Structure 1
């Protein structure tokens, strides 16, 4: 840790990091460069209550645990020179750094086949995006969503609640192929279908003409608005240009170090080790942005601190479904706790590998999720019959281990 500290990006990873630097006792300069002209804010509300209530003053991040930080909002870092230890800003200024931290997140992938579209086609990442989409959620209008990932499905649920007709096109045979157990994905499809979402599996968009979207089965979907949610791409351009190791994401170790001395990276922009799979992955979650930012800050201030070690997890709020998912989507065994039913949905899935818990899912069962994450963290090997048995208390099991 060399002063001054400069962070590029003012999202959750950046805020979490700078707050932890302060809390851990670093008293040198901190400057944060954020391209959005917005008081730092959290993204999960954008496809949830914000999309429904529209009050941005409910979604701001708490920067009060980060005193004495200059936030340069509405400014873009254009490049950095890792020899000179400087960053070039879009407003013509240059910042010196001792330690540079790249927390620039990721951007929605565009759909090449809609590039020349003459109808509204949006993606959903920013507050500006959310406002633009919400303005078009007219009751009885038709929305097409491209992509059956969590954000697309959260938008689908939000739009149906708003009285919007929703169609959704997914290239895979299932929803949430990226990070969800098949049992969960099958149920989620049944839920959205029951709520009036017109789901099209194993279809892709081939183009569009005069307000109608074309599919690869040679058919058509008329829509008033298209929202594309086919994944994201790391915002790693400054890193690539500066000669850091990148591949749709900046490679970092558990200390957040890039291949360039004195340059670190955090959050959605990073490709990092998933301790459960033992492979490098881009981990695109709120918990990662916060926890990785905190861990990297802590170890910079106190080199005796361990590197980042948290196991992955996320949640999704889709209408009546409060979904929580931790760890790996599959192993060699799944245990189902509760009935999987559209009538008052409430269940837990547990994924095992050779008897060891490697993942878990809770649907409308938050009480079970914390204990399961603890069992997951220690690689617990509980009695499978006990894990299945409804009479088993999971909190006690986690306390006993």
Structure 2
């Protein structure tokens, strides 16, 4: 930790990091560069309640635990020189740094086959994006969503609630293949289909002509608007240019260190060790941005502190489904607590590997999620008969560990 500190990006990872720097006792300069001209804000509401109520003043991040920070909003960091220890800004200024933190997030992947489209085609990452999409959610209009991942499905539910007709094209044979157990994804598809979403599995978009999207089975889907949610790409261009190790994401260790001295990285832009798989992955979650920002700041101020150690988890709100997912999507065994039913959906899934909990899912069952995250953290090996048995309560199981 050398002053001054400069952070590039003003999203959750950045705000969480700089708040922790202050709270841990660092009193030197902190400057944050954010390319969006927006008071820092949280993204999860964008495909959820914001989409419904439209009040951006309900989604702002709390920067009050980060006193004495200069936020340069609406400014783009164009490059940095890690020898000179400087950052070049789009407004023509240069910032010096002792420690540089890259917290620049990720951007939606574009669909190459719609690049020449003559119909609206949007992606959803920013407040500007959400406002643009929401304005097009005219009741009785037709929306096509490309991609059956979390953003696509949250938008699908939002659009159906709004009275919009929804079709959805997914290249895989299932939804949410990235980070969800098969049992969850099968149920989720039954849910969306029951709510009127026209799901097209094992299909791809091949092009579009005069307001109509073309598919690889030689068929057509007419739509008024297309939203593409086919994943993200790390915003790692400054790091690539400056000579850091990166591959769709900046490689970092548990201290947040890049391969370049005095340069760190946090949040969606990083590729990092998942302790449960033991492999490097991009972890594209809200809880990672917050918790990794906090851990890296803490260790910078106090090098005796441990490196980042938290295990991954996320949630998704898709209409009537409040989905929570921790750890790995599969092991060698799955245990199902409750009935999997479209009538008052409520269940929990537990993934085991040789008797040890490696992942858990809760659908409309928030009470079970915290105990299971604690069992997961210690790699508990509970009685499998007990885990299934509905009589068992999980909180007491966790507390006994």
Partners of 1:217 and 1:360 in 2: how far apart?
A: 36
Structure 2 spans left out of the alignment, 5+ residues: none
Query: How far does residue 3 in structure 1 lie from its aligned partner after superposition?
Result: 0.1
The one-character-per-residue Cα deviations of 1:43-77 (angstroms, maximum 9, x if unpaired) are: 00000000000000000000000000000000000
**Residue deviations 1:300-358, cap 9 Å, x none?**
00000000000000000000000000000000000000000000000000000000000
Q: Tell me, what secondary structure is at the counterpart of 1:136?
A: coil
Give the whole-Å Cα distance in 2 for the aligned partners of 1:201 and 1:392: 38
Q: How far is the alpha carbon of 1:183 from its aligned partner? A: 0.1
Which string of whole-angstrom CA distances, capped at 9 and with x for unpartnered residues, describes residues 250-287 of structure 1? Answer: 00000000000000000000000000000000000000
SS of the residue corresponding to residue 299 of structure 2 reads: helix
Deviation at 1:103, TM superposition (A): 0.1
The one-character-per-residue Cα deviations of 1:341-399 (angstroms, maximum 9, x if unpaired) are 00000000000000000000000000000000000000000000000000001000000
Counterpart mapping for 1:183-202 below 5 A? 183-202=183-202
Secondary structure at 2:295's aligned position in 1? helix
Q: Distance in 1 between matches of 2:210 and 2:287?
A: 42
Shift in Å, 1:238: 0.1
Per the alignment, in what secondary structure is the counterpart of residue 253 of structure 1? Answer: coil
1:142-193 CA-to-partner distances (Å, cap 9, x unmatched) read 0000000001000000000000000000000000000000000000000000
TM-score (norm 2): 1.00
- CA–CA distance in 1 between the matches of 2:261 and 2:53? 45
- Indicate the residue corresponding to 1:16 in structure 2: 16
Shift of 1:96: 0.1
1:81 deviates by: 0.1
- C-alpha deviation, 1:91, in angstroms: 0.1
Q: Distance in 2 between matches of 1:141 and 1:247?
A: 40
Could you tell me how far apart the structure 1 residues matched to 2:151 and 2:19 are?
Answer: 28
Q: Deviation of residue 83 (structure 1)?
A: 0.1
Deviations 1:208-232 (A, max 9, x none): 0000000000000000000000000
SS at match of 2:95: strand
Cα distance in 2 between the residues matched to 1:297 and 1:140? 49
Q: Residue in 1 aligned with 2:131?
A: 131
TM-score by length of 1: 1.00
Whole-angstrom CA distance in 2 between matches of 1:212 and 1:18:
47
Distance 2:349 2:32 in 1: 41
The equivalent of 1:144 in structure 2 is: 144
1:296, distance to aligned residue in structure 2 (A): 0.2
The aligned runs of 1:28-67 (5 Å cut-off) are 28-67=28-67
* Superposition map of 1:256-271 within 5 A: 256-271=256-271
Structure-2 separation of matches of 1:177 and 1:186 = 10
Distance 1:217 1:283 in 2: 33
Q: Which runs of 4+ in 1 moved over 6 A?
A: none
Distance 1:166 1:15 in 2: 36
Q: What count of residue pairs does the alignment treat as equivalent? A: 401
